[PDB]
Nucleic acid binder design. Structure first.
Lengths: 77, 219, 80, 155, 386, 193
RNA sequence: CCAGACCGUCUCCUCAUGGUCAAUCAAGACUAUGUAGGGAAUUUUUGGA
């Protein structure tokens, strides 16, 4: 079976400099300086709404990062 | 097979509570003329539990005469002692010095108790000799409780001893199978023993808490 | 610079240590011995001067240092 | 210690450090051993029972603690699980976990409790129950004593 | 499609039936795959069913490549590499797996030393190990991806059933997850060596079709007991309410007929089914003296046993076992047996490579054994003693 | 020679010997207390001990509960014994295999000889001086035992021998092998099932 | 799993405390106890910046 399809781009790859002052050390080794395809939709959501959330995503694709973001958001209050 | 024999015995030892579901004795005629012993169902059970299927385990037993009948002997205190046991025989220490402890307001030396696996109507050479050694010039009229034990039921064979046995014991300690033969049934007069649940009793043990010196040969 | 999470003076014995004195002359040397006053016997003493800008050098001693005028001992690089 | 074939409590009993050293087959470290033996739990326990009425039975326990404390080895406190059990050691009558703190170790510390009896037991009563203090951490502490019932006639 | 390294799925599809030929065929296939890979500079993982299988597989691999070409796996000149190998070969690598390591096609499994296992893990990470034969530990635990991932076989043995089941979708997916490295490489090679008949089933699974179906039926009772202990289920209504929030309820709502449900018309929002479930729970619990319960009156309260269970996270079955097997006259020998019987050791089993050691033990064991070497309980007891 | 090799492949002789020993031990276990037996110790012998025909040693040593009053050296089959000769706490046994052959196929005599020798010879590391030499003849399937005896032992031994020859699995294996070599068979039924 | 907040999870040096050794006619190295002290004002850690 061939390699699965590459994702359709209807979004902005969210960068690290868009964050506040303290959150800029969430990505200390900012290699890309732009989040992966998955987090670009989840980033705003993570920041905006204090609601119950669910990420059905591939294995090894920014789960940790997402968690970190969530933690940061929590700490913000 | 020094390694197989012990392990198996140990394994068996789980099924020792089962040997007091059925308990019976050849009911001797009850006679007030001589002193009669009243043993309890718990102490005996405990003893059985402690004991081995093959090897002879044997403690001292103590108590005193109650005020209902001075002729009746109530076994209150079992006294478990230092001992090295074999199959059909056992090496035992001196008469216990137990004045120091409380609840011993003149508890008299009633005698001793032991296990075995051969249904006799008399005391064997390894037993009689031991008895003699224990009570040579100390107490002539003390009794013995030989408990026959086998899977299913135990049996309480109580015995007494005359003045002739002591002498024999004194002369004929180690070996002596022909002299035993000569002695034979005489003299082991069937003393009077009862088993009750209307009284109960307790255990004295050594300070080390290691009464059985089977594998502690040096100590 | 490599130096681990070391606990005490006993666990850091036989290491190349920078040593600093009261007036401001910087040293380097392998710490041989211990004492009550930290009279630390240096294996090879290269003393350095800074005038009252830039650091100089010397090489006279392989010394028994005295405790009174020492400020604080810094590790440079492990041996072997 | 393992190889000498001796009851453990004997060592505890021994008083002099020299003596201790002698008894270990090693004159060196004897003092250390002695120091650590006083740093092992040792309870000079006593207990006087007494009947309140026919059914209920009070038990005045006197629990002394002879050992010397150490925050490293012992820890925060010393839990000692008290079991009142029958003459045989067949069934438990009453139990309680007690915490020996650093403040207790040495004082004449009393402990009181009550126990209702069975019917048969009430009718005809035993020679003595067994009160048993055992350490949840320390090995071979397991101090057990005879709670006397000699001529204890109920009202 | 949003994955960093896209997963190239692949099936072998074995036609053979008899196990002696079939196995051989599988091995051949694996070899072929490996050959295809290693020529491209591909670091590769080969999953298997069992622990004992792995070593044998490795051995087989070693005997196959040496005939054709030893050179392609050890290609480098090895002045420093050799030294490195020497350093990290003969330190504490006990299981006769050191040879495999030396060869350069090693293995990691539950039953390899903590140090040894760590070394194995890092002998890939440092950048040396070509082939890696593996049990299903690595997929569950460790993040370390490895370009090519082959899954050898379908039939895993689960002590749950006591029978050789197919590879469960949830595990397979996990296994597939580790593949081409998201950081370094571009894409991933995912292969399943399997029986052709079950491929049709596997394909669907691979497409992520079989959903998260609830297995709360087994773990319900214990949970309920715990809740009771905590002190908020006072009636069956309360229990039902509690269950409402759980995923099982949701699952039932979605598709009831398979999960023991009678009908949708009478129940509606499982206002009977839930009750029934509760009742079922509370009979068994009652029997194990874990909670108090009456059928008509309906009043709940937590017992001491229940509390104990809650505290120590003891399974209900285990608790039940404890209840009967512990007795007034139970002795030192029996305690060990009882412990062994604990249901948390139902998945434990004696093995052949364990056996010599066991034999050695059970002669000189202090606490005796009523059971014997072939029984797992006995083994457990001896382990405890050790 | 070839035939013999075929028969006795996979260390057959040794296996047989050990099997016999095991059987004996089992028998002893089954009746320990009846013969006043404390422990029946299996010697951890050198693999060779069975096919050493120069030396010997004990296989199954034996320990008394109390004391055994053993008889004079004598044959396994004998009604007339007296247990008032010598005493011991420790006894032993020796299972001796030998491939008999027409001249030297008398087993009893052989047993008598070897017992007489290996007692007196210093190299045979027997623990005690009183024991028995049970001698099996593989090549004729004849046992006989020679040595000392305590009351109730001899009959038991005889019984064991009777059972052993019927049952012992290594001996049965040997027999089977022999049959194969020869292509003797037992009839069963001639027509095909 | 089980003890934890009313509570000192952990010490660099000298002396004493008792047990040892290595020893010469009355003196040193080692485990351990904190029950001792550390402005013995000057040879150091409590004042020549």
């Amino acid at each position: 079976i061939p390699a699965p399809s590459k994702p359709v781009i209807d979004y902005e790859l969210k960068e690290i400099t868009s964050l506040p002052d303290w959150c800029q050390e969430a990505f200390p080794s900012s290699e890309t300086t732009s989040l992966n395809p998955i987090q670009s939709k989840v980033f705003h959501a993570a920041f905006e709404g204090d609601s119950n959330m669910l990420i059905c995503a591939p294995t090894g694709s920014g789960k940790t990062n997402i968690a970190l973001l969530t933690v940061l958001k929590a700490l913000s209050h | 097979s020094s390694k197989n024999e012990w392990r198996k015995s140990a394994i068996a030892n789980t099924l020792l509570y089962l040997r007091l579901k059925n308990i019976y004795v050849s009911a001797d005629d009850f006679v007030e003329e001589q002193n009669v012993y009243v043993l309890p169902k718990n102490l005996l059970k405990k003893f059985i539990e402690i004991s081995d299927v093959k090897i002879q385990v044997a403690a001292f037993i103590y108590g005193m005469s109650a005020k209902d009948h001075p002729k009746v002997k109530e076994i209150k205190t079992v006294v478990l002692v230092p001992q090295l046991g074999h199959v059909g025989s056992v090496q035992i220490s001196n008469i216990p010095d137990i004045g120091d402890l409380p609840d011993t307001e003149g508890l008299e030396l009633l005698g001793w108790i032991h296990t075995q696996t051969e249904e006799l109507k008399f005391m064997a050479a390894s037993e009689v000799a031991t008895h003699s050694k224990l009570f040579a010039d100390k107490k002539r009229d003390c009794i013995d409780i030989s408990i026959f034990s086998t899977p299913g039921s135990v049996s309480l064979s109580a015995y007494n001893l005359t003045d002739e046995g002591y002498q024999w014991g004194e002369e004929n300690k180690d070996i002596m199978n022909v002299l035993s033969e000569g002695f034979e049934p005489t003299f082991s007069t069937h003393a009077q023993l009862l088993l009750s649940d209307r009284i109960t009793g307790n255990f004295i043990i050594p300070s080390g808490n290691v009464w059985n010196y089977t594998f502690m040969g040096t100590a | 610079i490599q130096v681990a999470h070391s606990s005490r003076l006993a666990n850091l014995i036989d290491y190349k240590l920078r040593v600093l004195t009261q007036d401001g002359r910087v040293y380097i040397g392998q710490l041989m011995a211990f004492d009550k006053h930290m009279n630390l016997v240096l294996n090879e003493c290269i003393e350095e001067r800074v005038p009252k800008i830039k650091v100089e050098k010397r090489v006279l001693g392989l010394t028994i240092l005295r405790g009174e005028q020492i400020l604080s001992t810094v590790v440079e690089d492990k041996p072997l | 210690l393992e190889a000498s074939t001796v009851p453990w409590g004997d060592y505890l009993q021994l008083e002099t450090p020299a003596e201790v050293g002698r008894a270990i087959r090693s004159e060196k470290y004897g003092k250390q051993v002695y120091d650590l033996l006083k740093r092992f739990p040792k309870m000079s326990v006593t207990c006087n029972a007494q009947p309140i009425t026919r059914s209920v039975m009070r038990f005045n326990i006197e629990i002394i603690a002879d050992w010397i404390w150490d925050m490293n080895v012992h820890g925060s406190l010393e839990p000692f699980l008290l079991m009142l059990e029958d003459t045989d050691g067949d069934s438990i009558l009453y139990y309680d976990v007690l915490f020996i703190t650093p403040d207790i170790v040495g004082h004449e510390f009393t402990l009181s409790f009550t126990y209702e009896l069975k019917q048969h037991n009430q009718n005809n009563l035993p020679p003595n129950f067994f009160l048993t203090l055992i350490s949840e951490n320390w090995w071979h502490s397991e101090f057990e004593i005879p709670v006397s019932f000699n001529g204890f006639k109920l009202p | 499609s949003f994955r960093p390294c896209p997963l190239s799925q692949q099936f072998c599809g074995i036609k053979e039936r008899n196990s002696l030929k079939k196995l051989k065929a599988m091995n051949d296939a694996c070899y072929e795959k490996v050959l295809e890979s290693i020529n491209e500079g591909n670091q590769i993982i080969v999953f298997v069913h069992s622990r004992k299988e792995t070593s044998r597989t490795a051995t087989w691999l070693k005997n196959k490549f040496a005939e054709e070409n030893i050179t392609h796996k050890l290609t480098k000149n090895d002045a420093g590499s050799k030294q490195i190998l020497k350093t990290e070969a003969a330190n504490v690598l006990d299981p006769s797996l050191r040879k495999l390591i030396e060869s350069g096609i090693g293995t990691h499994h539950a039953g390899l030393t903590r140090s040894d296992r760590s070394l194995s893990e890092d002998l890939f990470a440092d950048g040396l190990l070509q082939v890696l034969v593996c049990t299903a530990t690595l997929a569950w635990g460790v993040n370390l991806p490895a370009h090519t991932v082959i899954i050898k076989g379908t039939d895993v043995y689960s002590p749950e059933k006591g029978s050789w089941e197919q590879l469960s979708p949830q595990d397979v997916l996990q296994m597939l997850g580790r593949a081409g490295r998201p950081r370094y490489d571009t894409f991933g090679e995912g292969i399943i060596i399997t029986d052709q008949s079950n491929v049709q089933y596997y394909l669907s699974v691979l497409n992520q079709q079989l959903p998260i179906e609830s297995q709360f039926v087994s773990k319900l009772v214990d949970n309920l007991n715990a809740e009771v202990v905590a002190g908020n289920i006072k009636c069956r209504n309360d229990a039902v309410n509690w269950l409402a929030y759980t995923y099982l309820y949701v699952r039932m709502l979605a598709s009831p007929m398979l999960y023991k449900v009678p009908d949708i018309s009478s129940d509606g929002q499982l206002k009977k089914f839930r009750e029934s479930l509760v009742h079922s729970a509370l009979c068994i619990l009652k029997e194990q003296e874990l909670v108090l319960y009456d059928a008509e009156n309906d009043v709940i309260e937590a017992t001491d046993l229940g509390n104990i269970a809650s505290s120590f996270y003891i399974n209900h079955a285990s608790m039940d076992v404890y209840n009967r097997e512990l007795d007034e006259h139970t002795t030192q020998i029996d305690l060990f047996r009882i412990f062994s019987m604990s249901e948390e050791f139902k998945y434990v089993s004696v093995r052949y490579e364990e056996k010599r050691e066991l034999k050695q033990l059970l002669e000189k064991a202090p606490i005796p054994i009523r059971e014997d070497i072939d029984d797992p309980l006995a083994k457990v007891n001896v382990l405890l003693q050790s | 020679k070839i035939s013999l090799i075929q028969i006795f492949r996979a260390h057959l002789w040794q296996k047989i010997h050990e099997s016999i020993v095991f059987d004996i031990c089992q028998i002893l276990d089954g009746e320990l207390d009846v013969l006043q037996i404390e422990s029946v110790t299996k010697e951890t012998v050198h693999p060779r001990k069975s096919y050493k025909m120069n030396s010997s040693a004990a296989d199954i040593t034996m320990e008394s509960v109390h004391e055994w009053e053993v008889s004079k050296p004598s044959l396994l089959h004998e009604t007339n014994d007296s247990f008032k000769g010598l005493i011991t706490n420790k006894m032993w046994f020796d299972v001796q295999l030998r491939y008999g052959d027409y001249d030297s196929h008398d087993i009893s005599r052989y047993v008598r000889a070897k017992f007489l020798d290996y007692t007196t010879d210093n190299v045979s590391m027997y623990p005690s001086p009183t024991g028995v030499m049970i001698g099996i003849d593989l090549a004729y399937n004849m046992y006989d035992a020679y040595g000392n005896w305590f009351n109730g032992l001899k009959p038991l031994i005889q019984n064991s021998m009777r059972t052993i020859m019927k049952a012992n699995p290594a001996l049965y294996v040997l027999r089977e092998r022999i049959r194969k070599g020869l292509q003797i068979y037992q009839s069963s039924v001639q027509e095909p099932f």
